[PDB]
Amino acid sequence: TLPKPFIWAEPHFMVPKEKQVTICCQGNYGAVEYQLHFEGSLFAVDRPKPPERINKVKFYIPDMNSRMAGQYSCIYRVGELWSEPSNLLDLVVTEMYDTPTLSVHPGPEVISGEKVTFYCRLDTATSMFLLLKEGRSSHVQRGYGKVQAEFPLGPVTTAHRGTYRCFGSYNNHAWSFPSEPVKLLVTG
């Protein structure tokens, strides 16, 4: 009946503790009420006025903390009907406690075709590790292991070029400090 809303974070979902993030919810033009929900509770509300030209609302979150790391959703109202929930957004808090180390095999400089594997180590956390690829063409990989996890990339191409940082975690939504970057140079 009502177009399903859409939720996303800005800049992205990895929020360093004490820092800020903005959660955006898109509903529909004219909607008079938007609610941001967090783990079964009401987090924030926004009532567009005038609503005719508005179809999105921004929820600002300053001073990020682990108690705010989790699953968010959004619903909006037009008249007396409420919409179905939006997609589920997971916010994680970073820079918690320690700093893991990152290493790569065979080395930081390779030619297309060489199999590359990254290794993240942190002995004071859980088995869940994460490999982040900086800049554009960004994304996050996850790996598991005791004290250390590996992230094999298989044969690489120049597309694998970029800066990498890894994270350790204390639970699925609470991550450590990013590791020192490793700039992978691919030739060929």
Side-chain angles (χ1 to χ4, degrees):
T1 311
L2 291 179
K4 187 187 181 185
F6 182 56
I7 191 180
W8 74 93
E10 297 190 343
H12 46 71
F13 77 102
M14 297 162 275
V15 192
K17 69 180 186 304
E18 287 169 52
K19 297 302 178 192
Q20 34 284 294
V21 68
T22 304
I23 299 179
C24 298
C25 178
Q26 175 187 303
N28 192 45
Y29 290 109
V32 298
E33 194 184 341
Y34 290 68
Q35 283 185 13
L36 179 63
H37 290 182
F38 175 67
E39 303 282 340
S41 65
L42 180 66
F43 188 88
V45 169
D46 188 290
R47 303 167 199 281
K49 295 173 176 179
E52 303 74 30
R53 316 275 174 180
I54 304 300
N55 83 321
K56 297 178 192 58
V57 292
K58 313 302 182 185
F59 294 109
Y60 187 67
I61 290 179
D63 219 296
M64 179 68 188
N65 73 67
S66 76
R67 295 181 296 299
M68 297 184 289
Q71 211 162 55
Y72 291 83
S73 61
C74 180
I75 60 173
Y76 71 92
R77 169 173 72 79
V78 182
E80 300 289 304
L81 173 69
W82 280 95
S83 68
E84 63 183 294
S86 71
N87 44 302
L88 308 166
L89 173 74
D90 277 86
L91 275 195
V92 309
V93 60
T94 63
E95 314 200 343
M96 293 293 281
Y97 307 115
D98 314 294
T99 298
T101 56
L102 174 67
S103 58
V104 60
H105 175 274
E109 288 175 46
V110 303
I111 66 174
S112 298
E114 301 203 72
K115 295 172 176 183
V116 172
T117 309
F118 279 98
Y119 298 90
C120 194
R121 186 192 58 182
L122 190 64
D123 68 313
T124 62
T126 60
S127 71
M128 191 187 111
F129 287 90
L130 306 132
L131 177 69
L132 162 64
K133 189 193 170 187
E134 307 282 29
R136 187 181 180 184
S137 66
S138 172
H139 76 286
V140 186
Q141 287 179 43
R142 171 200 241 173
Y144 298 91
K146 194 178 182 178
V147 179
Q148 168 190 294
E150 48 165 288
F151 300 86
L153 315 184
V156 301
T157 70
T158 52
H160 294 80
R161 289 172 177 164
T163 300
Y164 298 73
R165 283 193 177 63
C166 81
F167 293 89
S169 63
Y170 301 87
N171 73 54
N172 286 261
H173 295 86
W175 305 359
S176 66
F177 274 94
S179 75
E180 271 284 298
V182 167
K183 184 173 184 175
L184 177 65
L185 303 165
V186 187
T187 301

